């Protein structure tokens, strides 16, 4: 990916004199942070693009919804009645999604959760752990996104990241092994942000831009369910085949009712 | 008589200092410049970082 | 301490001319970044996902959610997003911008078109903005603009 | 217009938080349970503000007279269930309209 | 006897949030019906009934 | 009215006099029919018999 800025000279003089900005570090600061913003949102999109639709198969009570953890369904939340005993049932459901992923990957249970604001918030407004039915103001986590997208550690086990631009209420559970190979999605940085500059002699107006190269790949046993590869030699880049709704270390459930 | 008047409560007039009386203002005082905050990055400890 | 005051707000637009109409603020809190702006979007244009547009498997479509931002969708099932009714009056006023994205949000729920992004093929990046006889491949640009607001004291 | 869009629990009235609707109070049956649901509704709005502004979670609340005493008549922290005399806050408008710090 | 006082009520930019660019590069910062009526994203208002 | 105010049709609003009309109040510079707004006060009494 790459970008070019090409600011003007008379602007640099006027901006320096009037406001006090620089007009050069500004666009460089704009360009540098823009590209890393794409990549940071790029990897996350693949993760939700590759997660298996959760709460199905062996993580589903005989019949409740097959796909969504409805808060208004008696079957789903353990016949619970009041608020402080109903948010607790969500913890049990997520716990089920952790062991199932361990079953499909055979390397470990999920230990990081990607959820929208509300789902993260509803975890911060209940007592996570062996305790009576309780609820209150959100104190444990940082549902604020301006500070940082890192809610904290839920149950000492899960790492809860907040999805900023999440369209609906949902959570995605995944596993990350200590070895870098055991991830399920590979980010491959090839070349860092190389800065470029130049100036056309017809205007002398400076032109600058940035260029970078990176790669993305999936774990070989991403489709763990089939017992043989596709065509021996295969393309590790994600597509509508290797990764869409088939990757193993990612389960995603849409939460409705909150 | 000598009235200080006021701007016509118009964005152009207020910016330029043009009044409707005698005294003409220099211009609005600079209260400061407000940018837009930089959104955060959601880690990279949820995937592989193998370099090429 | 003056009869009037002014406040400055600086914005970062997407693409070439800053003050040009229809630009989109870059680091918007609500609106998410156009993740394909620096990559594939800098190479080819995508069809804009609209009502009653029968998609095809593998094609990428763009839409601007009224409260989330710009997204790129790669539909996996051949569907027409008009389904039930055209517009007519399904609910209260609910301008078609609200009806369309909710319809699209429904499809995202059902395993249909899913948000994706990617970079650019090195075959096109190497020749960006004119090289080796190539033409009409101008890389995307970024710029900023500054505006003002004024207040006059009352009595 | 709060309690709408992403902060609207489906099936509600989209703008009001009724105490007589089980959906809004999440099926609570007694004041020690229902009043806590109100605290959750306040939390949901504050986060929503941090989205549409991108500067931080809301940290100041203006509320009507009696609805302040309701906040003062529930166990603000995360606990089992409780209610009783309005002791935590200052519902007296004559002293000062600054009720105090919530949680 | 009499009294006088002058003050100024202002709004902050980016209040509308949804709008990504102002209208004329120089805009009336004072609140207005067209400018800010249930549009200021800083504040959210919730009713309560059956208290 | 209270039902309408919930719908958002009507809302509380408080403004201030434009400085042009502030200076020209009941007199100055030849303006007419622009009086001020006045506030006074009143005192009232009550009587108390004394039973036995």
Residue numbers in the entry:
A (entry chain AG): 264 to 521
B (entry chain AG): 66 to 117
C (entry chain AD): 118 to 201, 201A, 201B, 201C, 201D, 201E, 201F, 201G, ...
D (entry chain AD): 316 to 418
E (entry chain AD): 471 to 521
F (entry chain AE): 212 to 263
What text appears in the publication on this structure?
Here, we describe an AVV platform using phage T4. It contains a large 120 × 86 nm prolate icosahedral capsid (head) assembled with 930 molecules or 155 hexameric capsomers of the major capsid protein gp23* (* represents the cleaved mature form), 55 copies or 11 pentamers of gp24* at eleven of the twelve vertices, and 12 copies of the portal protein gp20 at the unique twelfth vertex. First, the architecture of T4 phage with a stable capsid and external surface exposing 1,025 nonessential molecules, and an internal volume that can accommodate up to ~171 Kbp DNA and ~1,000 molecules of internal proteins (IPs), provide ample cargo space to incorporate therapeutic biomolecules. Since the T4 capsid has a high density of negative charges, ~6,829 net negative charges per capsid, we hypothesized that cationic lipids would spontaneously assemble on T4 capsid via electrostatic interactions.
Next, we asked if the T4 capsid can be re-wired by CRISPR engineering such that it can be further programmed with a large number of foreign peptides, 930 or one per gp23* capsid protein subunit, on the capsid exterior. Peptides of various lengths consisting of aspartic acid (D) and glutamic acid (E) residues were inserted into the I domain loop by CRISPR engineering. Remarkably, the T4 capsid can tolerate up to 9 acidic residues (9DE) with no significant effect on plaque size or phage production. We then introduced 9DE-gp23, 10am, 13am, Hoc-del, and Soc-del mutations into the genome through CRISPR to generate 9DE-T4 phage (9DE-gp23.10-amber.13-amber.HocΔ.SocΔ T4) and heads for AVV assembly. A 3.9 Å high-resolution cryo-EM structure of 9DE-T4 head was generated, which showed decoration of the capsid with 9DE peptides between residues G201 and A202 of the I domain loops. The six 9DE peptides in each capsomer formed a negatively-charged acidic ring, generating an extraordinarily charged super-acidic capsid surface containing 8,370 additional negative charges per capsid (totally 15,199 net negative charges in 9DE-T4 compared to 6,829 in WT-T4). The 9DE-T4 heads bound strongly to anion-exchange columns requiring a much higher NaCl concentration to elute, and a slightly larger 9DE-gp23* band was also visualized by SDS-PAGE. A head-to-head comparison of WT-T4-AVVs and 9DE-T4-AVVs showed that packaging efficiency was not affected by acidification. Remarkably, however, head to head comparison of the AVVs assembled with the super-acidic heads exhibited ~5-fold greater transduction efficiency than the WT-AVVs, as measured by the delivered luciferase activity at MOIs of 103 and 104. Importantly, the enhanced transduction efficiency of the super-acidic AVVs was also recapitulated for delivery and expression of the full-length dystrophin payload.
